[PDB]
Enzyme design. Structure first.
Site, PDB file in Angstrom:
ATOM      1  CG  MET A  85      -1.832  -1.300   1.367  1.00 21.99           C
ATOM      2  SD  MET A  85      -3.019  -1.359   0.040  1.00 21.99           S
ATOM      3  CE  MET A  85      -4.197  -0.106   0.621  1.00 21.99           C
ATOM      4  CG  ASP A 129      -7.079  -2.402  17.431  1.00 23.64           C
ATOM      5  OD1 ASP A 129      -7.718  -1.437  17.866  1.00 23.64           O
ATOM      6  OD2 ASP A 129      -5.839  -2.467  17.517  1.00 23.64           O
ATOM      7  NE  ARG A 133      -4.870   1.617  16.918  1.00 20.56           N
ATOM      8  CZ  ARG A 133      -5.988   2.079  17.441  1.00 20.56           C
ATOM      9  NH1 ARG A 133      -6.296   3.358  17.353  1.00 20.56           N
ATOM     10  NH2 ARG A 133      -6.840   1.235  18.024  1.00 20.56           N
ATOM     11  CG  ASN A 134      -5.023  -1.401  13.192  1.00 24.40           C
ATOM     12  OD1 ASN A 134      -3.806  -1.498  13.063  1.00 24.40           O
ATOM     13  ND2 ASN A 134      -5.605  -1.561  14.355  1.00 24.40           N
ATOM     14  CG  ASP A 147      -2.288  -5.706  10.884  1.00 26.39           C
ATOM     15  OD1 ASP A 147      -1.883  -6.583  10.086  1.00 26.39           O
ATOM     16  OD2 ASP A 147      -1.584  -4.781  11.298  1.00 26.39           O
TER      17      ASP A 147
HETATM   18  C1  LIG Z   1       3.797   0.958   6.720  1.00 22.55           C
HETATM   19  N1  LIG Z   1       2.998  -0.226   6.403  1.00 22.55           N
HETATM   20  C2  LIG Z   1       2.259  -0.704   7.577  1.00 22.55           C
HETATM   21  C3  LIG Z   1       3.235  -1.249   8.602  1.00 22.55           C
HETATM   22  N2  LIG Z   1       2.499  -1.674   9.785  1.00 22.55           N
HETATM   23  C4  LIG Z   1       1.965  -2.895   9.910  1.00 22.55           C
HETATM   24  O1  LIG Z   1       1.804  -3.651   8.957  1.00 22.55           O
HETATM   25  C5  LIG Z   1       1.613  -3.322  11.319  1.00 22.55           C
HETATM   26  N3  LIG Z   1       1.309  -4.732  11.398  1.00 22.55           N
HETATM   27  C6  LIG Z   1       2.261  -5.701  11.536  1.00 22.55           C
HETATM   28  C7  LIG Z   1       3.602  -5.336  11.538  1.00 22.55           C
HETATM   29  C8  LIG Z   1       4.569  -6.321  11.673  1.00 22.55           C
HETATM   30  C9  LIG Z   1       4.225  -7.640  11.857  1.00 22.55           C
HETATM   31  C10 LIG Z   1       2.900  -8.011  11.894  1.00 22.55           C
HETATM   32  C11 LIG Z   1       1.919  -7.047  11.733  1.00 22.55           C
HETATM   33  C12 LIG Z   1       2.768  -0.698   5.124  1.00 22.55           C
HETATM   34  N4  LIG Z   1       3.115   0.085   4.072  1.00 22.55           N
HETATM   35  C13 LIG Z   1       2.812  -0.345   2.838  1.00 22.55           C
HETATM   36  N5  LIG Z   1       2.191  -1.479   2.494  1.00 22.55           N
HETATM   37  C14 LIG Z   1       1.843  -2.252   3.535  1.00 22.55           C
HETATM   38  N6  LIG Z   1       1.172  -3.430   3.470  1.00 22.55           N
HETATM   39  C15 LIG Z   1       1.008  -3.890   4.761  1.00 22.55           C
HETATM   40  C16 LIG Z   1       1.545  -3.013   5.650  1.00 22.55           C
HETATM   41  C17 LIG Z   1       2.074  -1.921   4.883  1.00 22.55           C
END
Ligand SMILES: CN(CCNC(=O)CNc1ccccc1)c1ncnc2[nH]ccc12
Length: 257
Positions: A85, A129, A133-134, A147
């Site tokens: 994304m 949740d 932020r999600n 998530d």
């Molecule tokens: C910045 N960012 C979000 C980063 N934060 C999370 O994903 C938090 N969850 C998480 C983190 C580590 C392990 C398990 C779950 C992204 N930027 C661009 N494409 C994307 N696709 C998916 C995420 C995502």
């Protein structure tokens, strides 16, 4: 396994952030396809439960849900491979004043999320949740829900400001606690990423909510938009709408406005 990606098929290209759940990287799958590689922090998750649930997660697919492509579990950290994304977290995007959003764009953000949530609700699946932020934003400005369900496996900060009275008082989770959180997320969008109940602590928010008080109308929300987000906050869970009804209401306002 069909939920299992070969990590040898990944090329890591850019770090995207580090956080409580772990480190996330941008990369390519088989030299060609953009992916996010989410690296679960060691000790942070119930990993055998998470892995079993990922098999269920593989069958969830909707244009407004961040697509899960697979997991890499034959090593540690385990990886979650997902849709990339480009524009990052919705919360940070909203707070970026350069975009100079029109309210038509804000309502479209709400509809993107509502379509994802309507799909999860048709599958009897709770996000648990839901908040800005999600949610994530792709290179075309489309918002997608991220998530969903993940908090069930986190071994550790609770989302007080996105929770209805029956969650705060009794831990009563249901479709209607996702509905309540959706209304707060609408408020976040129309407030350009302000913290809900910004002048309060979590403890003060909980007391406010229990006394029957509420967030009030963001400057950028029309009366009709406010009616929609406020309907998500009925004290009585059973009086709150479904996501199908919220989607219909949002589409109607898009047509009027
Ligand atoms: C910045 N960012 C979000 C980063 N934060 C999370 O994903 C938090 N969850 C998480 C983190 C580590 C392990 C398990 C779950 C992204 N930027 C661009 N494409 C994307 N696709 C998916 C995420 C995502």
């Amino acid at each position: 396994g069909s939920w299992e990606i070969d990590p040898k098929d990944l090329t890591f290209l850019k770090e995207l952030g580090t956080g409580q759940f772990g480190v996330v990287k941008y990369g390519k799958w088989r030299g060609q396809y953009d992916v996010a590689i989410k690296m679960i922090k060691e000790g942070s998750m119930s990993e055998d439960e998470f892995i079993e649930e990922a098999k269920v997660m593989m069958n969830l697919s909707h244009e407004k849900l961040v697509q899960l492509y697979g997991v890499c579990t034959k090593q540690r950290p385990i990886f979650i491979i997902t849709e990339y994304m480009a524009n990052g977290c919705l919360l940070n995007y909203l707070r970026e004043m350069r975009h100079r959003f029109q309210t038509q764009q804000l309502l479209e953000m709400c509809k993107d999320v509502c379509e994802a949530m309507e799909y999860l609700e048709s599958k009897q699946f709770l996000h648990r949740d839901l908040a800005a932020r999600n949610c994530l934003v792709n290179d075309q400005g489309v918002v997608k829900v991220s998530d969903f369900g993940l908090s069930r496996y986190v071994l550790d900060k609770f989302p007080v400001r996105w929770s209805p009275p029956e969650v705060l008082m009794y831990s009563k989770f249901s479709s209607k606690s996702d509905i309540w959180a959706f209304g707060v997320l609408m408020w976040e969008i129309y407030s350009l990423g302000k913290m809900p109940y910004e002048r309060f602590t979590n403890s003060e928010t909980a007391e406010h909510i229990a006394q029957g008080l509420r967030l009030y109308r963001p400057h950028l929300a029309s009366e009709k938009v406010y009616t929609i987000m406020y309907s998500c906050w009925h004290e009585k869970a059973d009086e709150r709408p479904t996501f199908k009804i919220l989607l219909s209401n949002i589409l109607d306002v898009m047509d009027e406005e």
